[PDB]
């Protein structure tokens, strides 16, 4: 099986400007949103049809109540952080928790907090410690590390619970998540600035978004400057990407166990 991940984010905003909710929490499987909750709806809702038809209302009802409490906890934590820094006005507080099931069958788990979009606290589940960025993060770290049992609960959540949820959600969304759509790849040649020939290797219509594109010269790696396009969503569940060079050249594309060569 390919590599897959489960992540949940929380976003808290103090003094929100007209329109922006005070709290948002979104769940993802790889790049697909699966769940959402915000301080306006005050409801946990599916963001994928395969989540809706495989999880009973009991799930959605139970987590709505938990998210209502997590929303309140985020409100208070952000007030305490702003007091610690002597900060007024609108500030942001973020959390990211998740796990990965790697192709070799091994796992990773992470739990992180940000303040104003910058790293603040990083959990180390292998030593049960929190990594602090400054003295305010250190004050919070001392409080969190005082509760040994919450540190063990968190290790267990990341290493066992998170993985069991990921495997459950992979089964529910298998027709979308475990499918493969091969890339359509083309090489375009064009004289740009006088005396300059540009080669563009463009890929589109591929799923999953993980692709490898590289330009080779006479069979070995290029040492010249290569430009890269972002892996962009096309809107239909597929992606597009590109790689370009200047001036025997070939574009190499690897996607979901298939290697493709385009010789210019």
């Amino acid at each position: 099986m390919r590599t897959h991940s489960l992540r949940y984010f929380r976003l808290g905003v103090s003094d929100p400007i007209h329109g922006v909710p005070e709290f948002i929490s979104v769940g993802y499987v790889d790049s697909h949103p699966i769940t959402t909750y915000d301080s306006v709806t005050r409801q946990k809702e599916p963001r994928a049809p395969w989540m809706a038809e495989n999880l009973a209302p009991d799930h959605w009802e139970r987590y709505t109540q938990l998210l209502r409490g997590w929303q309140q906890m985020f409100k208070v934590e952000l007030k305490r952080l702003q007091r610690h820094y002597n900060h007024s006005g609108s500030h942001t507080y973020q959390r990211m928790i998740g796990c990965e099931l790697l192709e070799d069958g091994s796992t990773t788990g992470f739990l992180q907090y940000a303040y104003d979009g910058q790293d603040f606290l990083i959990f180390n589940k292998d030593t049960l410690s929190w990594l602090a960025v400054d003295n305010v993060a250190h004050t919070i770290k001392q409080a969190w590390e005082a509760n040994q049992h919450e540190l063990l609960y968190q290790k267990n959540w990341l290493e066992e619970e998170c993985i069991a949820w990921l495997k459950r959600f992979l089964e529910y969304g298998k027709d979308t998540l475990q499918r493969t759509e091969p890339p359509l790849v083309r090489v375009n040649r064009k004289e740009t600035f006088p005396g300059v020939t540009a080669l563009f290797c463009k890929a589109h219509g591929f799923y999953p978004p993980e692709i490898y594109m590289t330009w080779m010269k006479n069979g070995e790696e290029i040492v010249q400057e290569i430009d890269y396009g972002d892996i962009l969503p096309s809107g239909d569940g597929t992606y597009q990407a590109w790689a370009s060079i200047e001036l025997l050249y070939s574009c190499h594309v690897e996607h979901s166990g298939v290697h493709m060569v385009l010789q210019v």
Partner: antibody
Amino acid sequence: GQNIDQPTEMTATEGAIVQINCTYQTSGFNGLFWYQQHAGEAPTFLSYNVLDGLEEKGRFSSFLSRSKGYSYLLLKELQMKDSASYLCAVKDSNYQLIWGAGTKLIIKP
Amino acid sequence: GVTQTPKFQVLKTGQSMTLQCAQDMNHNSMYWYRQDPGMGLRLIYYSASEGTTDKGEVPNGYNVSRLNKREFSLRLESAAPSQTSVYFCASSVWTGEGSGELFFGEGSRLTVLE
């Protein structure tokens, strides 16, 4: 969440040792608790376990095996004051607390 | 920490009743349980934080009110003999956190007679 089994009652002698088992069959696992409840009194928290091992608190120790879905509460140097009910509870995948029917413990003087 | 009232109460069938529960531990989550012989504690209603409440396992014949952060009252609208039990109020710092234990009230013994 589904089933938590612990013996209805247990009898042991004063100054001796007793082990109270708790087996659970749940949808997910977020920790296991032991509460002590004296006759006609409120339950009081004794211990919490979520990773494998044994933790000691005075004459009381709590053990957990996640793979066997089993825990035990061990009391050493049994005293008459240990006559009480012992409740086992497990947090499932949805953080719902599933309670066991309790174990009444009788200490023979 | 957790103060619940009344300790004992005799009720006639159809009669209404309210059990009070306050905590001054700054806990966000509050619960109402009933304890019956031979079974595990059964959650009636719970309040994950101030401003929200939800049904537990046995909500029928009951209703709750999270009045503020400190108080969670349980109401018996029309008492039935099946509601004869020992009622416990409990609080925890939060819900949706594995290790947080419950802090129990002293108990409320309720007897419902025809």
